């Protein structure tokens, strides 16, 4: 299985799990404050992950820095 | 305080906390206007389980 | 299963999931504003992903930048 | 499963899905305007993809550019 | 306008919009002369489902 | 594309897209399993009105 | 919503949306009370074409 | 499962699918005009692909250009 | 099956296991004090791991340091 | 090669190449499952005419 | 996060979280399968007290 | 434990935790005997909101 | 001409078009002396199918 | 279509496509009314050879 | 599965499919004229491929140039 | 299956096995004195390993040193 | 001495040897306050098996 | 399944398929003349291949040149 | 399945197999004297290996030297 | 090697190596399934002649 | 560690750890399947002696 | 063996291992005849603690 | 000559063509003293099959 | 074919292939009418040896 | 499945197939004369191959030359 | 499966197979004299191999030289 | 499935197959004289191979020469 | 090693190591399935002779 | 001599040839004091098989 | 064969292989008629030791 690393570079970063299946809704949204780190897998229930707010992200494809306004 | 409202809920980015999209109830949050954090469920599930037992 | 990284370089970028199967329509479109990042897998339900608006994209095949306007 | 990346370098690029099976017809044709990007897998239903119009294309075999009519 | 005919249909490259190949009905488009975009199906399927219900 | 199926139909929160409540047809969605969005009616109304006139 | 009914139809200036002129059906709108925008035709034509095929 | 990339360098290039099985006929021929690109997999029905006309081709084995 | 290495660079670091499944709650939080190291796999029950407090972390994707 | 089977035979849209409609033989294709193209008849007629003369 | 389910509920050592002892409901946990921690009661009591007042 | 009852409630200085003033229910605490901290509301409001939804 | 005999058949390299190997019928070509190209089958199969139907 | 009947046959100039000369069958075309092009033979010979083998 | 690339360097190149099984015969022979290219897999029916005439060939083992007299 | 190498750099290092499953408790705690080495796999029963005290550690991810209290 | 108490038991880091967490019995050690080394089990299991047999 | 490339460097090269199984005989021998190339897989029926006459050969193990006369 | 190499650098090195399963005890300890080498796999029965005494050790993760006294 | 089994035996094209035609033994090969080549008889004749003399 | 289970128990060579000989309980080990080592008795004796005194 | 009974117990010098002093039970050893070493307690304490838990 | 004895048989290296190892029949060659080449079997099998048929 | 009967046997010059000399069987060929070449023996010997073993 | 390449550098090279199973005998011995090449797989029937006489040999392990008697 | 190479550098090297299973005993001990080489796999029956005496050893992990006194 | 290459550098080299299973005996010993080469797989019946006499050996682990 | 099982026992060619011929015990090997080599008897005789003397 | 005792047995390193570990029978060698080489079994199995048959 | 009977035994020079001296059993060989070589003992002792264990 495949996972992502997300380090918040500011307070109030959101990691949002989008539901696997026919319908696409947000079943969950974890908050990160500046410096906290979440490591999240894709699952039977999460088939897309949305990040908003400034954060440093590591994926199997390499690093990308989110810039999000909040 | 150790736990804030921001640690329990987060305003739904899609409906900006409204719960409706131009009349019809929002898909993403499912009419709740907020999506709950893991900390939020933790307590809600806990309480809902043991309350009035 | 594969996935893509999409970082919006402007407000109002759309990531549109095209339905797996005989018929091809779009079951969902996620909006991204400047800087938001979506990480989306191909699924039992999404067999194609369309990006419109200025965005930085990472795939298994390497980087590509989608151009808006 | 395999996918391709297609970035249109002009308006009116067509990505055409040719049907898997004994018979070969176009079940679908997605339009891309200048700069839009499509990421399409081969599926139970698409066993060939045709691109027409100027476009930048990424496959597992490397990059190739389609030219405009 | 946000959505054009171009966004719904595309002329079939095989029959050049005709729908017949020297008399016989075209294979690729299946006598339609046009093949539909995802946006096209999205609406057509939506309409066809809910109309007259 | 500018308008998706999500923009037209929303899964009914009561029957979770089923259309029936333990056998009997759902009240909220009216057996449709989906509640139509404003955008949905916009088109459906429009079409139903002008089709075959 | 991206596209509203105002984007598809416009009230006919001649009959002020009525569809009749002192009893007799309106010429300009052709008894429809509303005239269609290019966007309106685009959809209507599209649907009329592909529906039930 | 393998695939080929084919870019036409002239009008009227043909990609011809030869039928999988005991008998070998061509079930289909796609036409490409100068610059069009086809991406075709081998399938339950195509076990060989023939290219005629000037074209640039990419396979798992590397590039080859037809004339 | 994947795992993570977590070394606390301060007292009171928390590694929190988020529950696999439709619902996301935290079943467990391990405390680490300055220098302790935890090595945790993703499991039938943990599908996400949250780290808070200054820590040095090693994943299959490389090093990242939390603050 | 210049002429393919696609150039000779086209699957009948009515019976989806079956040749029967829920048991009874298809009207459109005439139990053939395929409609012959002009190119198809060209050869078939040609051959039928001159063979064993 | 500061408080986890482990902080609220602890599996009952007698029934190994089952809640029954070879059929009959467990004495120690009182059919709960889990023994609530002080933190657990803190909240549960708090809520039970002030909810719907 | 991270959060204790003292973190949520504080004895009402007016009624010394009684809830009544010589018979009649206390004004300041509003018959609760205890006044809520910011942390207290945060939870109570959160729970009250999401419980049984 | 668009299609030549060389586009339909090729002389069998083993029997040099003979069809027999020192008396006995050739294995490779199977007594045909020629092996058919894909273009060859395409037509032969087509004709054999639809002739005298 | 790549190859047409005109590619295979040409009307016999002697009998103007009739096949008979004032009753008696035409010499030049040999009662066929049509004379064959090189392309015509190529196919006919090919087919005649391999059919029913 | 494994395939070969064959580019004819002259007119009348033959790609000959030899039958899979106990018996070895030529079920098929495709003609290539100068410059045409065939891409052919090994199949349930072809377990050997013979090339005759001048042609450029690419296999999983690398390039080899056929020189065949016809 | 995966393992770790643990070399204690002081007396009284603890390698603690945390239980696989819904509940997370310590089923076992091995002591190592200065220089002893433990090689432990993840198992049907151990899904996390905690190290405390100064120790040199080798994983599939590379080396990391635990510091003493 | 070859084997010390340290070689058999280790104090539970969670409950600091107490066996209770603010009243309720500790999860990690399971009310034991200590967790056992391999050497510890080796003897305990050995003894428990053969004692009084 | 494996295969070999054989290019004949003279007329009358033979590629001989030796039968898979308990018994070893040759079910088939293909003739190659100067320059012809055969590409032959190991099969349910061929478990050894013999080359005689001057030929250039490519295998999974690298190139080897068979010498005639 | 994995294995380790252990070369004793002194007399009286112990390689101790810790039991796979819910319970962790040591089913066996092999003695090594200076220079002896043991090559031991992880098994249906050994899920952890403990080394005490001066020894040179090779694992999939690389070399580590256990220190005695 | 100079002579292969292919050089001795050729599969009978009539029975495709079977030796029976829908039950009854094949005429062409004479129940052998294979037709012997000239080389085949050469040896068989030779041997049959001189063996055990 | 200094003492292992191997040091305490040795599998009985007669019953190969079974404890029964084709049904009937083993004589040598006395139904134990294992023979206790001197080290084994050392501890067992020791414990049995001083336990609960 | 690493650990012997001599390592756990030592004969009491006062009663020379007897356990009684001219009839009455020995004070020093407390009727045990043997006094325990630190190693002895270590084990006994350990076992006594964890046995039957 | 095209085929020599060398091309059919090879002396068994184990028994140096003897067929016995100090009295008992050789394992490798199975009392044959020679092992056969592919060319050898090819003929032997061919002959054995068709002789006296 | 690689090997012909001429390669195995040669007509006996003495009896001109007859096998008898004015009634009595020929000495040179030994009633065979044909004498064998080295190639002939090679095969015959080989076969005679290994057949039915 | 694995194969070997054998090129004889003299006349009368023997490639001997040793039988798979409990018993080990030579079911077959192919002769090669100077320059001939054999490509032989290990099979359900051959679990060892013996080469005698001067020959050039290619295996998955690399090249090795057999010397003549 | 995985194997080891053992070359004895003196007379009387022992390669000892330790039994796979719950119990650990030596089912077999092969002797090597100076220069002899044993190539032994791990098996359904051998889950550990002990070498004693001076020997050169090759494993999947690389070379190690045993020094054993006998 | 693995195999070994063994080239004898003297007359009378022995390759000995040790039996797979609970019991270890030698079912077979092949003799090689100077220069002969044997290529032997591990099998359902051989789980160890012993080489005695001067020989050059190639394994998946690299070259080793016996004496 | 200098002597192998192959040196002592050889599989009987008649019964292919079975020891029975379609049920009845094999004649050649005498139900042994294996024929003992001279080396085999050497030892067996030797031992049988001197054992328990 | 070709075969020595060292080629058949090896003294058990664990019990130094004794067969007992401080009284109890040794595990490693299984009371034999020696472990047998492959050469050893080879002969022992051979003999045990064929002796007194 | 590597080892022969001559390698194990040698005829007793005293009794010339008889085993008796004018009736009474031979002293030197001890009634065996044959004396054993070092190699002989090596095997005999080995076997005698391990047989039936
Ligand atoms: N219960 C969620 C937890 C989770 C895993 N990965 C995530 C990514 C984003 C948000 C939540 C998650 C799930 O199993 O899917
Ligand atoms: N429910 C969607 C979520 C999703 C995954 N990838 C996407 C890409 C685009 C839009 C939505 C998605 C699905 O699983 O298919
Ligand atoms: N519904 C289509 C979507 C699709 C996937 N890949 C494509 C390539 C081209 C066009 C459409 C597609 C399918 O599953 O096949
Ligand atoms: N329906 C065809 C489409 C196709 C795949 N590969 C091709 C190559 C050439 C022509 C057509 C095709 C098939 O699936 O097989
Ligand atoms: N019908 C043939 C087509 C083919 C595939 N690969 C080939 C190679 C050579 C000749 C023909 C072919 C087959 O499936 O086998
Ligand atoms: N009918 C043969 C064809 C073949 C494959 N590889 C070969 C090598 C040599 C000779 C023939 C062949 C087979 O499948 O086995
Ligand atoms: N019992 C938990 C232990 C665990 C694994 N990974 C974790 C990460 C964090 C906290 C606990 C864990 C489980 O197996 O899932
Ligand atoms: N009939 C033999 C052919 C063979 C394969 N590999 C070999 C190696 C040596 C000798 C013969 C062979 C088999 O299947 O096994
Ligand atoms: N009996 C334990 C042994 C073990 C394996 N890995 C561990 C890590 C830590 C502590 C103990 C262990 C188990 O199988 O899980
Ligand atoms: N019949 C033996 C042949 C063999 C394989 N590997 C060996 C190694 C040595 C000696 C013989 C062999 C077997 O298959 O097992
Ligand atoms: N009969 C033993 C032979 C063996 C294989 N590998 C070994 C390693 C050491 C000792 C003996 C062996 C077994 O199969 O296990
Ligand atoms: N009987 C033990 C042998 C063993 C393997 N690896 C070990 C490591 C240490 C001690 C013993 C072992 C087992 O298979 O599990
Ligand atoms: Zn919402
Ligand atoms: Zn068309
Ligand atoms: Zn509803
Ligand atoms: Zn009007
Ligand atoms: Zn039809
Ligand atoms: Zn309980
Ligand atoms: Zn009050
Ligand atoms: Zn032919
Ligand atoms: Zn005419
Ligand atoms: Zn505790
Ligand atoms: Zn026939
Ligand atoms: Zn017993
Ligand atoms: Zn006393
Ligand atoms: Zn022999
Ligand atoms: Zn004569
Ligand atoms: Zn027999
Ligand atoms: Zn012992
Ligand atoms: Zn005597």
């Amino acid at each position: 299985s495949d996972f992502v690393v997300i380090k918040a570079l500011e307070d109030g970063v959101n990691v949002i799990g989008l539901t696997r299946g026919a319908d696409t809704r947000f079943h969950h949204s974890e908050k990160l404050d500046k410096g906290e780190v979440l490591i999240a897998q894709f699952t039977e229930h999460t088939s897309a992950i949305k990040v908003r707010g400034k954060a440093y992200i590591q994926t199997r494809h390499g690093v990308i820095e989110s810039e999000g306004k909040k | 305080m150790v736990i804030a409202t921001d640690d329990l809920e987060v305003a739904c980015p899609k409906c900006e906390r409204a719960g409706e999209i131009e009349g019809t109830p929002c898909p993403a949050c499912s009419g709740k206007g907020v999506i709950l954090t893991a900390q939020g469920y933790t307590l809600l599930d806990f309480i809902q389980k043991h309350l009035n037992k």
Side-chain angles (χ1 to χ4, degrees), chain A, chain B:
Chain A
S1 169
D2 221 352
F3 66 96
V4 313
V5 174
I6 308 167
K7 180 185 179 182
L9 307 172
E10 56 180 11
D11 303 326
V13 163
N14 304 339
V15 170
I16 295 173
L18 294 69
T19 42
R20 181 179 300 279
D23 301 8
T24 312
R25 59 173 225 284
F26 318 147
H27 54 82
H28 184 87
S29 167
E30 192 68 19
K31 173 165 186 194
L32 293 178
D33 289 299
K34 193 197 194 179
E36 283 170 343
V37 175
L38 176 54
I39 311 135
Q41 286 187 316
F42 290 114
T43 62
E44 189 192 304
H45 297 88
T46 313
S47 53
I49 301 172
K50 192 175 178 190
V51 177
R52 26 166 32 217
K54 203 186 198 312
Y56 189 86
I57 292 166
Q58 314 203 290
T59 59
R60 188 171 133 267
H61 295 332
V63 307
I64 198 154
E65 228 227 19
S66 83
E67 259 163 19
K69 203 143 175 246
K70 278 135 239 171
Chain B
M1 81 173 144
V2 203
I3 298 176
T5 321
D6 293 16
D7 288 311
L8 301 146
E9 301 167 309
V10 164
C12 167
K14 207 172 202 164
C15 63
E16 291 180 315
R17 223 160 201 151
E20 281 178 324
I21 308 289
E22 286 194 1
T24 16
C26 188
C29 68
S30 302
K32 253 287 165 183
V34 279
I35 303 130
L36 293 186
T37 61
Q39 180 81 74
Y41 270 141
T42 297
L43 301 178
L44 195 95
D45 196 292
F46 172 77
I47 304 302
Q48 212 136 228
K49 222 166 171 184
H50 311 287
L51 195 47
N52 311 326
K53 203 114 278 183

